[PDB]
Each structure stands twice: as C-alpha cells, then as structure tokens.
Amino acid sequence: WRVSALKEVSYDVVVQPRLLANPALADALSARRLIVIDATVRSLYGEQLAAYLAGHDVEFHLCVIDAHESAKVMETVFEVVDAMDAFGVPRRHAPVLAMGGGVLTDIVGLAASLYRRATPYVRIPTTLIGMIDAGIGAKTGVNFREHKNRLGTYHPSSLTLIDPGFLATLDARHLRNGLAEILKVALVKDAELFDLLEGHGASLVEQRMQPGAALTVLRRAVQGMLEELQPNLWEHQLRRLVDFGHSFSPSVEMAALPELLHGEAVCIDMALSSVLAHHRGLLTEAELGRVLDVMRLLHLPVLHPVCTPDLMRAALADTVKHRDGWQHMPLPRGIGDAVFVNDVTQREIEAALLTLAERD
Amino acid sequence: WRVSALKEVSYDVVVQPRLLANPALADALSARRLIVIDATVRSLYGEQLAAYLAGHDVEFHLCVIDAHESAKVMETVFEVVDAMDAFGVPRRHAPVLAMGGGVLTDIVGLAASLYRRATPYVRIPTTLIGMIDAGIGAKTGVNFREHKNRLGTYHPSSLTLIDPGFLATLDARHLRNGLAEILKVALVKDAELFDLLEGHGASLVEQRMQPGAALTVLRRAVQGMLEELQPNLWEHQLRRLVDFGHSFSPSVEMAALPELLHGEAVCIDMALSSVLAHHRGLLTEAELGRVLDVMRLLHLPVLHPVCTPDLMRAALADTVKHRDGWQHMPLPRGIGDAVFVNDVTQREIEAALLTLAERD
Numbered sequence A, B: 001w002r003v004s005a006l007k008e009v010s011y012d013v014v015v016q017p018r019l020l021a022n023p024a025l026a027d028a029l030s031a032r033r034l035i036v037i038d039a040t041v042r043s044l045y046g047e048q049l050a051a052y053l054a055g056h057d058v059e060f061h062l063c064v065i066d067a068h069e070s071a072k073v074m075e076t077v078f079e080v081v082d083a084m085d086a087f088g089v090p091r092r093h094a095p096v097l098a099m100g101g102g103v104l105t106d107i108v109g110l111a112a113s114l115y116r117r118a119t120p121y122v123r124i125p126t127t128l129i130g131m132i133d134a135g136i137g138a139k140t141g142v143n144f145r146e147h148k149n150r151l152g153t154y155h156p157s158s159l160t161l162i163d164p165g166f167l168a169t170l171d172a173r174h175l176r177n178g179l180a181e182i183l184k185v186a187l188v189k190d191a192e193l194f195d196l197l198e199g200h201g202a203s204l205v206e207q208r209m210q211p212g213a214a215l216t217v218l219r220r221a222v223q224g225m226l227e228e229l230q231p232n233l234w235e236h237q238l239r240r241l242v243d244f245g246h247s248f249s250p251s252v253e254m255a256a257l258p259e260l261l262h263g264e265a266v267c268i269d270m271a272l273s274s275v276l277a278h279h280r281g282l283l284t285e286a287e288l289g290r291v292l293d294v295m296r297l298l299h300l301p302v303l304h305p306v307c308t309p310d311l312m313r314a315a316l317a318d319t320v321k322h323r324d325g326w327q328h329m330p331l332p333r334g335i336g337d338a339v340f341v342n343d344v345t346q347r348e349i350e351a352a353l354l355t356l357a358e359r360d
C-alpha cells in the first residue's frame, strides 16, 4: 500500500500593542487556561496579566519556569508536561499560553507538540529574539547534551501576539541580541532593512524599540522571516537564506555557555561569513566595512576565544551532516542578497578568523 | 499575518515474505545504516540479518534494545538518540531501521521524529501487533508516568516491510495478542474478517499464521486499519472506529503492568463494550454470544481484577479529556459495524462488569 495524506497548517502572526481595557488577549484564549510564563516576565508583567484575565473573566494557573539556555533541555519540557497533566488540559479546545523569551516558547512549544501528540498553544514573545524569530516560526526544540536544538518538532502556535511594549523592559544587551537576528534578514534579503539599522540602530537600542522607525524595522523583519518560512515550513528544501549566521554559531554558542547569547553567537557567524564573502569578491571592502560597523555600533561581538580553527572546523562538520552532506552556506553577495556555497575550505576559514582577529 | 502551508505525507506498506537470495531489504536502505533491533529478535534473526546485509554490501551497527512496556519511556528514546549521534546519522539520505515489536518501533519512531526534528526511518515489524497495527500507522510515542502513550508524534516510516515469517517464532500468547487487534477491526468494520477468525482462529494461533487463510486475514486487517488512518492521519476527526477497544484499556493496561499485554487489555475493553452494546439492544444475545466465544477460543481475557468500577470510571474520564470532552465511544452494532455514543453512564458500566463477571 501507499498511504498519502495532506496536512493544512495555518497560523496567525498579529501585532497587538498594549496587550495587558479591551484588545484580544481575552479572545485569543476563548474559560480556564494554563499559562506558562518566564520567571522574570512573571515578576515584571504578572500583576498586570492577572488583572487582565480576572477582569476579562478567565481563570488560570501560572506555570513559572526560570528559563535559560543551559536548562533548555527535555527535563524542563517534562516540567511543562507535568503542569499540563495536573491542570487537566483537554485534547484541543483549550490552548496553552506560552509567555516569555525564545527559550520559554521553544520549551512549551515542544511540550505542546508532544502532549497527546499535538496540543494547541498560543505564543506571546516578550523578547526581541522571540518577536522576530523564535516566536513566529514552526520550529521548536531543546538541546541534547552538547548539541544545540538537537531534539524538536515543527509545531507553530495557532496564534502569535506581538506587543513591542514588552521590549521596554529589556536591557541594552538583550535588545542588541535580537537586533542581531534582524541584521541577519537584512544582510541577505533586505538592503532597506540594513539601511534602517545603520541609520537608527543606536537609537533603537537606546529607546528599546519604543515609538516610527522601530515599527518599520520590526515589520520588515517579520515579513522577511515569514516569506522564507511559509513556503518551506518543514525544511524540505535545505538551502535556506535564514540559515545565514547559523552554520558555525550552534557549536560556538554551546562551547561558550553561558558567555554568549544566541544572537551574539549568530553575529560572530555573520561576521566570519561576511569576511569569507569579502575574501571571495562577493563583498567589496566598502561593504564589508559597512557590515562590521553596524555590528560594532550595535555593540555585537565579531569574535570569541571559543572560536579556534578546530572548533570552527568541527562546527562546520556538524552542519554539513545537518544539511544532509552539503555545506549550503549562504554568503552575502553585496548587502541585501546572498549566494549558497559548497566549497568553503578550512584554509579560507583560518584566513577569515585572522582577519576578524585584526579587526577585533 | 497568516502563514499557511500544505504537507504531503506518503509512505509504503509492503508485504515481503522471506525478508532475510534477492528481495529488497537491500534497496529499502539504499551504503551504511543504523539498525535498532529488539533484543530477542537479535538473538533469533540476528545471524541471518547480518549475513544478508554483508552479502548485499551494506555496513551497519546494531543498536540493541531490550524492549518492554515498563521501559517504553523517554529515557529509552534517549538511548536511541545516543546511537544516532554516535553513528553520525545524516539529516535524511540514510534512513534508520527499526526491527522489533510495537514497543521497539514506537520508541525508534519517536526518536527519529525528534532527531533534528524529523529523520526518516524504515520499519520491520516482527510481531503480529506490529504487522497489522503498530508498524503501519503514523502514531509513535512513549508512556509518561502512569499514562499510556502520553508523549508522541505523527511520524510514519517511509516504508514498512511485513514478513509473516517472523510470526513463526512467536509464542501462542503473543500470537493471540495480535489477533486481538485484528478482531477489533472485524467487530466494527468487517464481518467477513470476523468470520475468518471464528472459523480459523484456533488453527492460526496453532500455526502461528504460517501458510492461505492467514494471508487473507492479515491482508484485510491491514486494509481495514489503513482505510481508517489514511483520511484522518493526524486525527483531526476525533470519532474513530479504530478507537474501539481503546477507551478503557489504556488505564487498565497501565494499572495491571506487567500482567496484561496490549491486545489482552484491548480485548477486555472490547468485551466490556460488546456487553454494553448488548444491554443497549445494538447486539443480540446470539451476536454477543458469537463475540465472546471467539474471545475464549483465542484464549483472550474478558476481565481482570484491576477492572473495578472506580478504575473503569477513571479510565473513561481520562478518555473523555483525550477526546476533547466527548466520549465518542464506538459500540458494535451487530457484527461488522459500529455506532459512536456519548451517553455511557457509570451505571451501565457497572452492570456490564457484573455481566462479564458471571461469564468469566
């Protein structure tokens, strides 16, 4: 026999300022709902969130996770599953709410995907990484031993609600961190987005993306990411523009734990790859100069001591397996476009590391 | 934004006698492949399997699991993931082989579904439960605490290879156990299949389904199950004929561990439900008599001491949550058809338990 079936996945990504008075957190839910919330968010937006739901007639239980990258593992997933069991979450008419950064929503997303083999949830990203990348995709997952995101699923939330108001309480470091993922999109897809960052990047960090440039920047980032994910949501096509900055960074992020945030590790990979592109003639000296200056302006690292030739080698090799025996490396071709290569040599990487070393 | 994407899942279910000389185990694979094999199967068919692959020019590493229901848990999944890591299984061009019963292939299936968020595998079911149910579906999963199959995914193997020759080495108990899942299909879908079992059931157990009735029986069982799974592969429709015998049995199976095999627990549920149907007028005294006689003839239990009114209650309640607040209970309407009910009362269940008690 052949069995063949089609699956329609569709989900919503909606910008909804002032989320916690009338706007639909209330009817994103409906009523009794389980809410899995990042500890620091709980401390910061808990009083307001609970006032919302009680006034809007919704009973709830907060499952609080103190979320960080080291504990982004299966045991934390079991903690969320425990909460679903004790709350009595039903098969599908009562979605679970994940409210936190990209660590939180990746964990709850994977718990929800496993629970009875699929359980609907809603995402409320509270960090910049969450709002323009981690909270709007289909990918979920956790680390397994020294391997980044080794275990996971494709399980988008049926709704993502983005309220840029949450970014107001981030510190400069995490604001910049999320700006790294926006720069990724810009460098290979969107020259105007790159321009907005160069022109406004400092102010956006200083103002924590509070307001109308920040609004434009967030809109294009999301639009950029979604154009890339929507037609390739389960990554049947393994050449992915969005893989830019993610060829070396997984091994680098894991080896430096906990010194580098995800976007910082991503930026090291982007700076390496941009130097690679330059050495190849795909980027001019002037353009390379433009990229590395936005990076220093966003106070983002271009290098780390974890980043030795051997680690860079091992990092690449782990990625070739992930990409099914191909490098499929996106290199920027000018600013706002990219090419996929499969002939990156260890020699080229060492030269590019030295070039970063003199810059840095 | 709305993101909407379509996913084409298709997979093959092929009957291939004499699997381990020329037939395609060889080109189900292609070469270097990881094989996860049930311990007892390894002891029984290992010498032949390795002789096959070496002669057919395929290098391999056996990951051996001593598989049983108590250890059908996530830690066993991590054992399989460990083996995938150390073997260096690539993203998708080298499928992993699962060769064992329904515990084995459920575990490897869930490991494969999680590994890099999806990894192809092939299934070779070696038990009757595997050949007509566990090895031909899309469902995978493991138990979480005292809950049956609480964690899992929809991830069919891209190929299932069924060789009835493997059934030759099962003992009578496990042959009957798998006959229970065939009876399930027959009671609600296939009167002719029911007839084949009543007419041949004893011989089929005695001959361990070795040969042409056994061939007909296996073919209709598979065909019956697949007609049910193919148009509802992710269970968007929660009224499922194949849920017959699976409303009480999960809690019963778990509470009696390790006294009841899966199909035996299923049969207790089928015998209870058939009595329920009878008390309702959906089954005649004669038909009820026909069903319970096939069950005694297959030496399958109709009752267990685990099966108290309170457990039966709790068991039903766990299922109503699983079915999103509905009972959606399939009751046989005559033999070879069924109706879905949502008005089963605790009173009716107690009466049916007493009726089983006098029979048993």
Ligand SMILES: NC(=O)C1=CN([C@@H]2O[C@H](COP(=O)(O)OP(=O)(O)OC[C@H]3O[C@@H](n4cnc5c(N)ncnc54)[C@H](O)[C@@H]3O)[C@@H](O)[C@H]2O)C=CC1
Binding pocket: A038, A039, A040, A041, A044, A067, A068, A069, A072, A100, A101, A102, A103, A104, A106, A126, A127, A128, A129, A130, A133, A134, A135, A137, A138, A139, A140, A141, A149, A166, A167, A169, A170, A171, A174, A177, A261, A262
């Ligand atoms: N699934 C996907 O497609 C993607 C997943 N990711 C994952 O995202 C993860 C990192 O996400 P992040 O959000 O950067 O990390 P995070 O979840 O660890 O949060 C960063 C920090 O900010 C705090 N925080 C959160 N919201 C806050 C707020 N509004 N105000 C003040 N403090 C707040 C948290 O408590 C935490 O200390 C990585 O594990 C990365 O793999 C990244 C991109 C895509």
Ligand SMILES: NC(=O)C1=CN([C@@H]2O[C@H](COP(=O)(O)OP(=O)(O)OC[C@H]3O[C@@H](n4cnc5c(N)ncnc54)[C@H](O)[C@@H]3O)[C@@H](O)[C@H]2O)C=CC1
Binding pocket: B038, B039, B040, B041, B044, B067, B068, B069, B072, B100, B101, B102, B103, B104, B106, B126, B127, B128, B129, B130, B133, B134, B135, B137, B138, B139, B140, B141, B149, B166, B167, B169, B170, B171, B174, B177, B261, B262
């Ligand atoms: N995913 C799905 O859609 C379904 C999954 N299942 C799962 O199947 C599991 C039970 O599967 P079973 O195969 O009954 O159990 P099993 O995998 O535990 O195997 C039963 C026993 O037979 C032995 N064995 C296997 N093949 C043999 C052979 N050819 N000769 C001799 N000994 C052999 C095994 O070592 C084991 O001791 C349950 O956990 C049930 O939930 C059942 C139906 C459907």
Ligand SMILES: [Zn+2]
Binding pocket: A133, A181, A246, A262, A266
């Ligand atoms: Zn990233």
Ligand SMILES: [Zn+2]
Binding pocket: B133, B181, B246, B262, B266
């Ligand atoms: Zn079953």
